[PDB]
Amino acid sequence: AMGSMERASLIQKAKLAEQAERYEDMAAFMKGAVEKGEELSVEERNLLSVAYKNVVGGQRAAWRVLSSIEQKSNEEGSEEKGPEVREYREKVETELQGVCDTVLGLLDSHLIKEAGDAESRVFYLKMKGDYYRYLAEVATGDDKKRIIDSARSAYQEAMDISKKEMPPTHPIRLGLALNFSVFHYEIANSPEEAISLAKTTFDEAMADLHTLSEDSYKDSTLIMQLLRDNLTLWT
Amino acid sequence: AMGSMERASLIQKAKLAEQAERYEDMAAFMKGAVEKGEELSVEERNLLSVAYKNVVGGQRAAWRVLSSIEQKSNEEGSEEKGPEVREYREKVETELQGVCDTVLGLLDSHLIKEAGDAESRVFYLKMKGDYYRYLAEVATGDDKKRIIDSARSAYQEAMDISKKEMPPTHPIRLGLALNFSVFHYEIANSPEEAISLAKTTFDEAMADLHTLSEDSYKDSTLIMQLLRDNLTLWT
Amino acid sequence: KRRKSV
Amino acid sequence: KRRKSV
Ligand SMILES: COC[C@@]1(O)CC[C@@H]2/C1=C\[C@@]1(C)CCC(C(C)C)=C1[C@@H](O)[C@H](O)[C@@H]2C
Ligand SMILES: COC[C@@]1(O)CC[C@@H]2/C1=C\[C@@]1(C)CCC(C(C)C)=C1[C@@H](O)[C@H](O)[C@@H]2C
Ligand SMILES: [Mg+2]
Ligand SMILES: [Mg+2]
Ligand SMILES: [Mg+2]
Ligand SMILES: [Mg+2]
Numbered sequence: 001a002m003g004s005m006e007r008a009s010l011i012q013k014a015k016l017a018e019q020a021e022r023y024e025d026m027a028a029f030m031k032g033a034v035e036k037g038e039e040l041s042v043e044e045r046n047l048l049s050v051a052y053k054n055v056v057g058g059q060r061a062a063w064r065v066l067s068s069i070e071q072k073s074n075e076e077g078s079e080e081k082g083p084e085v086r087e088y089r090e091k092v093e094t095e096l097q098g099v100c101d102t103v104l105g106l107l108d109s110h111l112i113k114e115a116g117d118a119e120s121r122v123f124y125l126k127m128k129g130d131y132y133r134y135l136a137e138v139a140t141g142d143d144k145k146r147i148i149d150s151a152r153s154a155y156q157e158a159m160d161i162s163k164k165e166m167p168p169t170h171p172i173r174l175g176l177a178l179n180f181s182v183f184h185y186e187i188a189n190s191p192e193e194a195i196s197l198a199k200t201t202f203d204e205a206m207a208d209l210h211t212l213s214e215d216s217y218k219d220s221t222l223i224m225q226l227l228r229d230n231l232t233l234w235t
Numbered sequence: 236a237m238g239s240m241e242r243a244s245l246i247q248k249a250k251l252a253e254q255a256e257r258y259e260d261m262a263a264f265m266k267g268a269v270e271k272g273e274e275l276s277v278e279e280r281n282l283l284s285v286a287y288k289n290v291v292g293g294q295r296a297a298w299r300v301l302s303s304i305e306q307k308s309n310e311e312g313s314e315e316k317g318p319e320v321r322e323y324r325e326k327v328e329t330e331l332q333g334v335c336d337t338v339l340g341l342l343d344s345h346l347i348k349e350a351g352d353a354e355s356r357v358f359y360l361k362m363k364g365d366y367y368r369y370l371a372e373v374a375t376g377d378d379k380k381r382i383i384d385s386a387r388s389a390y391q392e393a394m395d396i397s398k399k400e401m402p403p404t405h406p407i408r409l410g411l412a413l414n415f416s417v418f419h420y421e422i423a424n425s426p427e428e429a430i431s432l433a434k435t436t437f438d439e440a441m442a443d444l445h446t447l448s449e450d451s452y453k454d455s456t457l458i459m460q461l462l463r464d465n466l467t468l469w470t
Numbered sequence: 471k472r473r474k475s476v
Numbered sequence: 477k478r479r480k481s482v
Binding site for chain 2: 009012013016017019020021022025058061062065066069081082084085087088091092
Binding site: 130175178179182185186223226227229230233234 | 471473474475476
């Protein structure tokens with residue numbers, strides 16, 4: 001598929017697609033690079049995450065627009081407009097699930113198993129939690145609890161390694177905690193745990209800022225501000 | 236393709252895709268509606284134009300980013316980075332050309348030939364000029380002059396009908412003139428003609444505003460302001 | 471204001 | 477400021 005292009009060319013192209021805001025192309029170039037079978041560097045894992053986060057973020061935003069329409073069509077006094085809204089929300093939903101499944105497949109074949117350093121292992125497990133969480137945002141049936149639990153288990157393993165192996169200010173640790181806190185708040189119906197996790201994470205990071213260079217400080221304070229934005233919204 | 240979906244369902248879905256900012260889906264739904272073979276209403280022609288204008292506007296903006304990179308890679312003192320930038324600009328270029336060709340095909344099979352009213356005929360010919368103009372923005376070879384002349388001929392036929400059959404304030408007439416003026420300025424190397432056309436169009440519209448209702452006035456003054464923005468940029 | 475994720 | 481088209 002991208003099988004005949006050199007890994008470095010795929011990487012170069014993914015960077016060009018990002019510059020061009022062509023995130024679907026970016027994701028396909030990164031998928032091809034992962035499929036070459038070599039581990040990803042830090043910068044390459046970032047590219048992979050950015051590409052898919054943008055693709056799925058477009059699909060999730062569209063799904064929410066369509067979901068909200070579909071719900072309004074189901075309220076008392078609404079005209080029957082036929083199956084179209086449901087069908088089209090399903091179409092977008094199916095495409096979004098396919099993207100989640102593609103990323104989860106890349107993580108399982110074979111990113112996670114070959115990731116030995118904390119920074120790589122936690123990064124990929126956070127991705128695993130994030131894409132199960134996007135599956136949970138749309139899940140409505142028999143498997144919903146198991147999808148939620150898959151997101152939980154992945155975030156939890158990433159939390160456990162990050163706590164042991166990374167400083168409290170590490171951006172990956174902070175972003176992981178931010179997302180696991182969102183998972184608690186809006187997926188697992190645990191707003192208390194979400195608040196507690198965002199607070200503890202923010203405070204432990206504040207206390208370690210003194211160890212950092214100016215650039216590291218800026219990196220960490222940026223995600224800390226996201227934790228604060230959520231705490232402000234939720235309290 | 237969209238062959239098994241009802242025309243009204245395609246139209247309903249195109250409107251939902253627009254709300255969801257899913258312009259590729261919107262365009263495919265509108266293509267399916269055109270392919271049902273019935274003429275389009277005013278609102279439906281608008282949907283068709285919006286869908287493709289957005290799709291191609293994304294591809295054109297990406298092509299310009301990639302073109303500018305490719306040109307910088309070809310300046311004195313630039314490191315050879317290999318074929319990737321050119322290949323990827325070509326890939327985006329080819330996709331953009333395919334979209335232009337799809338729209339031009341819909342216009343030729345059989346929108347233009349069945350469009351008898353001025354408002355429909357001028358609308359579709361303006362689209363024909365616009366999509367040949369997007370082809371001309373990327374054309375570099377043997378056919379470039381003929382592509383430019385195809386854009387010119389389509390805009391010219393639309394100008395001639397619009398002058399005879401539509402008031403000077405009609406939004407379609409104003410938008411046609413705006414785009415044909417852009418064609419003159421940046422495709423045909425005729426900035427004088429571009430300026431003259433934008434000025435004359437603006438002035439003739441100003442003089443007819445008095446005939447309009449408040450809503451029509453707002454509609455016409457909006458595109459007139461686009462003519463003015465170009466005149467300000469170019470003079 | 472939508473909650474933040476990263 | 478890019479020229480306008482519609
Ligand atoms: C899998 O989790 C990926 C991520 O959410 C964990 C935290 C953050 C991640 C993504 C991204 C590549 C995109 C947004 C940022 C920013 C905060 C600019 C970065 C990096 O620059 C950070 O160093 C860091 C890796
Ligand atoms: C083929 O040419 C299509 C077009 O450029 C000619 C002028 C304008 C067109 C497109 C679009 C559907 C999108 C932008 C506007 C706006 C100005 C809102 C409209 C309509 O609302 C106008 O009534 C009108 C048909
Ligand atoms: Mg009713
Ligand atoms: Mg390893
Ligand atoms: Mg050099
Ligand atoms: Mg007819």
